[PDB]
Design a protein around this ligand. Structure first.
Ligand SMILES: O=C1Cc2cc(Nc3ncncc3Cl)ccc2N1
Ligand SMILES: O=C1Cc2cc(Nc3ncncc3Cl)ccc2N1
Ligand SMILES: [Cl-]
Ligand SMILES: [Cl-]
Lengths: 124, 4, 124, 4
């Protein structure tokens, strides 16, 4: 087509979605991790994660307001990944890299799994 | 704004 | 902080939100324009428009599944702007610029109003 | 990935 494009549009949209999350506006699901609860927007979770995409496209699960993750999932790893989903920023540290990679593998967040693999390979 |  | 950032994350999120819109997945509102109906996600509309932000933060309107726009709003202008919201791409043409600018002013989409004003000023 |  002959469209023009606003370079900062996608980033501004994500920033606003994160402001709605902060203020708990229109959040429609609670993700339960080892008795730690995280409120979020189903559409943002689906846009970022192959696991949430599969869950909320399921005719029965699409209607659930609570999703319980596998008990092996670490709440801090989930929190870091939820922050990444809403900001593009990943708080990756020596002390959390293993939990973050394991959580990204479970959530099916391929780009996160890739950078964790590379950061781990550099330390060996 | 840009030409994409 | 000491975060790393994935450059294409925001764009990939918006692309996935647009794929959900195309497939009518988790859309939670119908916007009615001069008897033309557009299905969308409330959160994306709020992230892009000052008008939708005010509407869906209202305690009564946040619960509506149908929103009727002012009858002076042109459906094509709305369609072009809805596409922009989900893609960052604006189909701005000599034949639609006046309707697009009038719709962007009503929807409170300041960056769109700005480029329309500049494109109109260049033609005078 | 970049340093923001
Ligand atoms: O690594 C990843 C990130 C990711 C996101 C999604 N999301 C969607 N895919 C396609 N159409 C719509 C949506 Cl919402 C699916 C798989 C994966 N895998
Ligand atoms: O031009 C514009 C675009 C736009 C978006 C919004 N959205 C939000 N603002 C702040 N926190 C959350 C959200 Cl969702 C408000 C006003 C305007 N004005
Ligand atoms: Cl990812
Ligand atoms: Cl705008």
């Amino acid at each position: 087509d002959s469209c023009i494009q606003f370079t900062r549009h996608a980033s501004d949209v994500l920033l606003n979605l994160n402001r709605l999350r902060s203020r708990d506006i229109l959040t429609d699901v609670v993700i339960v991790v080892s008795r730690e609860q995280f409120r979020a927007h189903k559409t943002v979770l689906m846009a970022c994660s192959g696991l949430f995409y599969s869950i909320f496209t399921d005719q029965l699960k699409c209607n659930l307001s609570v999703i319980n993750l596998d008990p092996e999932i670490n709440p801090e790893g989930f929190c870091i990944l939820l922050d990444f989903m809403y900001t593009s920023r990943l708080n990756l540290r020596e002390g959390n890299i293993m939990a973050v990679m394991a959580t990204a593998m479970y959530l099916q967040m391929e780009h996160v799994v890739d950078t964790c693999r590379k950061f781990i390979k550099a330390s060996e | 704004w840009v030409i994409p």
